[PDB]
């Protein structure tokens, strides 16, 4: 077989964690800094 | 008896409790720093006044650490799948509640520093909203404890 | 779950609230009725204290004159806009830059046309708008040919991008400067329209009509102004914007115009332009076309303020408040001329 | 036997390496010279 | 003069708190022999013989509440002296 | 009704409900006394720190909540993560456990934990001194502690909310508005009581009646509540709480449902009746009334649901205190003979500073603001209209 | 388009490969190895159950955080020139956190019925166990997503209300109705979740 | 176009402002040319600074 | 007897049936509230007259709930595969129809609020458009019902 | 003699026959709104004269409704793979044809409604275009019928 | 007795704890250097007042180094699966925590460098923020040393 | 990687050397390092073609 039950379990769990991680990574990676200072 | 895959999932939970939550805190701190810059030049006397958001980010980190230690002491070789998935669920939930709270505090802290830079009376108001951010993290932590028994 | 509304505030929530608060500072009809009864300039300042504009004349203006009033109003303008700019991230920053390009072009052409007359060399600074100030505002006094003007503007002033390949001339007389003005404004409108349509979302929907109207307004103005002058017709055809609703007849009917009758016969084809031109009948007692155009402009900006997450609430806002300044000035002018005959020529807002 | 293990191993390692090289090369290809002095000026 | 009280009063409060809590810990570890409810940790691995070892080692562990507190006994006395220097 | 005399004592009580720890109570009280005793000196002084100014403005609240924190921690029996053991435990004596067929099972127990089933027939005993201390090392303390906090928080919230809502009748009679009391507060109170006083009586009933020997077959309260909410009536799988459940439960739910139409529909008809008797947009009147009524119903459900922050903060405090004890200065227990207290010096210095910087200052502030939020929203959105103006005196400045 | 190109590429490639393998299996007469039964049975229900437990508060807290920040930025931005609206607009954040309260109570309800077993083959685990696991996982997903979208909606409407209230101070009383109509769906999800998980009897 | 040359120097102490009184930074520059046309044309640039 | 995995399809059918309808209702109400809040500044004296699209948006949530209640009630631990597939089909149909109705109602109410602010006479016309959105969602309901009682 | 999972495809057909079609209708109406209000600001009398694209979108929805009802009525527990595949095909075809027709009708309606506010004689020509976009949906119905009777 | 692939997870941790940690440092020293580039001009004598973020980045790199080395030092051929999962979890957690800390330190350093350039008294306060970011680094290390033995 | 480096550096340097001849010789030095990088990429492969 191309898969075994434990493999499917681990794959689904890792996929969930990976989706959550890439969401967080997108949000942090869009951060930008200011250009000039006041006064 | 139990499969050998069983030890995997539970351990992974611990990692989440020290990745996701931590990451949220990180964002928060960074954003707050930018705010301080925009406020430092014009109203220099209130630099230490704005110590309040950054600590309120670090607390999220603290929460993660707590749960991590717990899931480093309940781990044993002979773990059934039931325990493993309980622990994975706890780790996932606490990490994500930390992340969401971190994003909220970061944005609110930027807005708070910028608002106080032009209106002292806004100070108290910002603090109020900040509380509603931090408490969210605690909610995640709650189920972690509920998942160390059932 | 609309396309553009989820992520707007994350970095543009504070400034939006600040500008929306500042939009309450426009004076309604009641304040204008109140202010039209002033007996002297000191009376005007006393009333101005009670409104949102209060406390910008605590100086030693014992011989108060309209010059100080205008200067303080413009100072409030530039300080407010600069503070708004200095707290913005990259997209909003390009937006506000695009706004100030207009005043930059205006100042450059004001200075070149001033120094075209050798009688003035360095006393032209106070007249230029402080908003449109770039590092090389004084290089204009070294340009004998427009190529040298390009070489001065090229390095840091981004206006190069608007005329880098649109001007090819070696002699700098007093006629071509109008061509410079028209071409630079044309490129500015085109680039701004392209940027707006790229930005996408509700900003495009809520700002396309304004730019379209501005394009048609400038087209009609340049057509009417060039009736009885040395400007050739093909060059005029080479000067219209291409972002309005007059695209076909702009290049197929306006260029074939020679008196006001044909311009009327082209403007009456559309409903809104027909109405606008009929209202401005050019009678001795009726307002000129410019006043009706300003009325429509203010109407469009006022209508544009009914969408929550639209960037142009900044751009629109600035334009609107600028008009307000003009209004106040006119009132004070009557108080300087000691007659209230034409004091009602103001154009109300909100 | 153990076909599933070796297959998943090869597949995920290969995907990781390919995605890494693709994204980094995309970053390198898109980079800004400057269009600032050397490049901006003409004539 | 040297070590003005402005940057040392917190030191005095901390020293007072330390000495009081250390005396409390030593007393409840020695007299009450630190009943296991108030103390998990101990010092051995083979305790299959009898109770003499547990109480003996509990006394040895409580004895360690000495220099601990004594350390402050002094540090507080030094910090008060620095406070006095005006 | 000025809410000062209520809040002035219900704020330290609530802070104590979410600050169940005694040593930290002593620390906060010492802080408060330090600030208070220098009243004359500080007021006759030039200060600059704004934190110091706000804390000196709130010295009264700080002192009161420190004093209450001391007591609530004492009944918590959690002083610095340990239990103040008065040594009145009555749980396990050896020949009693051997009487219950249990001898030399620790041999296999060297690697397992061996929960004991309760009630061998010779043990029990509550504790007058708050919470029995033995829980502080029991590895299953979390379950009973959480159950206790759940029931604690819900019960206190319901009673405090009843106190909040019961005051509006005073003002209604005071302003002489009969239409707003007969067909006003009465349906509100009957609805709230019939819904939630039922939960209170049921939970006390489960606490008091079901003995240990009936552990199996014992019911779940939330399942019963959901069952009556959905009107489902399974004949098996859960046993009735007490005789005559069906009639009483059905009657309470139907009267609760029949309470809504009064406030929803009746009063504007009467207003229109008197207006017509005279001869006022009647549609607007029923619109506003109906908005108010649906807002009350949904809001009261939300407020009753929002009371769990008490449990949340209490649990966070418990866990944080345990970890702060058991991670850093737990290492102080060691084998050294001469150089041990030396290390303990720095270890406790670090521990004290860290608890100062993690719990005494910032999380306490979060708890205090939560108490404030509870004192505002779920309290004063029942009777406090909040629409007026204070004085702007002509005192010179 | 700055980096979402990667996401679109992954999505399209994944679905194209899925179609290709599906048709390849179908025309090859090799459908007997596409046993959905094997996947659904040999995966222990505990993984589904704990995924549901986690999600039921994951999504609720995410929605609550989204709502609080989207309303907070606007309220504080408007308060800089209108301090009178600072305290008045607490109700939006109250409604935003109400969804988190609902999520956590749902987690408490679902968390019960978690009795471990010792079966190892599907016949031993049995229909009741499989139904319980699937049903409670589905209920968790439902409550999570419903609370998430309720939170986003109430955050948006609260932002609009707060922005508008700074202008004319007699407008707040005519915009909470949309807020309540938003909270309705957040409650609807909770009650449907209860209706789903009513009859779980795992053991 | 490089036909002239420039070299700069600066004073570490900040320099008072006649108008505002500020201790704003200032610096000195020396420029060398080759002819009179440069001496003429360069003042237009120099007076802008 | 039926196979062991019968209830999965019915459960997921009910879950999707509620979830997608809630998505649609949330979008519709958010957009309608945006329009109302934008419009209130100019002509506040018409606010009651313009909340109609929100009331119509709630009906999508009602449809989702009724299908969810029926479909959960019919469920049992030992249904046949035919029934569970009917369940899944009905759930998907009602959910997607509700989402489409929400999209339509949101955009139409958004345009209509400003349109009515411009000219009162538009109002009745707007109402007609609203009906031709609402009935669309309604149609979906009835189809699902025939699938659920089959 | 027949598997039961053969029923699956059939029910899926029903869903499509009401899902994708429904989506098309929604989109059409939305687009019409962004024209209709935009037209009423100057020439209110024309409002009743610009409702036609919306009724045509209604007919587009009705097509999907009738085909879905027929498909659902045909369903039964003991269906061979033949009839199930036929149902799936008919549903998919009608649903997506209706979607395309609705998309075209929406763009056409917006453009024409905006245009007619200036040149009244456009009117009749506009309606010609509309019918040429309605018959599209009609053709979907035809093929579905041929699959249901067979 | 134990499969050979058991080695997998273990040494992947021995890689990851290094890898991601380095990435964090590559953001801490880089963007801070870009900020110091602007700082150098207006006041070239504050390089010692701006060398903080780079030392922070080096510190986090050392943290990654020590966890990676310690985990690698516990390698053997007959490693149990349990130990392998433990090492992978520890390594991944410390690596990602280091990455987040590096991001935060870099952003705050770039802000505060020029903030101090314009405004001298910011400098001391700037250090405060950096310390809190550094705390996150500590926390990652803790978990690994809690997962090395237990 | 070598191709990327060579392309970018060559563009920037060639556009730069258009104005100042002295930079020209310096340009080659940078390019030399780019070549060296490519050389490493060959060398490893060589050993893996015999081991």
Residue numbers in the entry:
A (entry chain c): 413 to 451
B (entry chain g), I (entry chain o), J (entry chain n), K (entry chain h): 6 to 155
C (entry chain d): 4 to 353
D (entry chain p): 599 to 641
E (entry chain f): 5 to 90
F (entry chain a): 389 to 667, 712 to 829
G (entry chain b): 3 to 204, 206
H (entry chain a): 192 to 240
From the study:
In our cryo-ET reconstructions of ISVs, we found both ‘intact’ (that is, V0 and V1) and V0 domain-only V-ATPase assemblies in the ISVs, demonstrating that a mixture of intact and V0-only V-ATPases exists in functional ISVs, consistent with observations of V1 domain dissociation. Refinements resulted in maps of the intact V-ATPase assembly, again consisting of three states all at 4.3 Å resolution and a map of the V0-only V-ATPase assembly at 3.8 Å resolution. Starting with published V-ATPase structures and the AlphaFold2-predicted synaptophysin model, we refined atomic models of both the intact and the V0-only V-ATPase assemblies in complex with synaptophysin using the wild-type ISV SPA average maps. We observed the glycosylated mammalian-specific ATP6AP1-binding partner in our maps. In addition to six previously reported glycosylation sites, a putative glycosylation site was also observed for Asn399. Although both e1 (ATP6V0E1) and e2 (ATP6V0E2) isoforms have been reported for subunit e, our high-resolution V0-only V-ATPase map suggests e2 as the subunit present in our sample. This finding was further supported by mass spectrometry experiments, which only detected unique peptides specific to ATP6V0E2. The luminal parts of subunit e2 and subunit a form an interface with synaptophysin, and electrostatic interactions are involved in this interface. The interaction is identical for both intact and V0-only V-ATPase assemblies, suggesting that this interaction does not appear to directly regulate the hydrolysis mechanism of the V-ATPase. The confined membrane environment of a synaptic vesicle, including vesicle curvature, probably contributes to stabilizing the relatively small V-ATPase–synaptophysin interface.
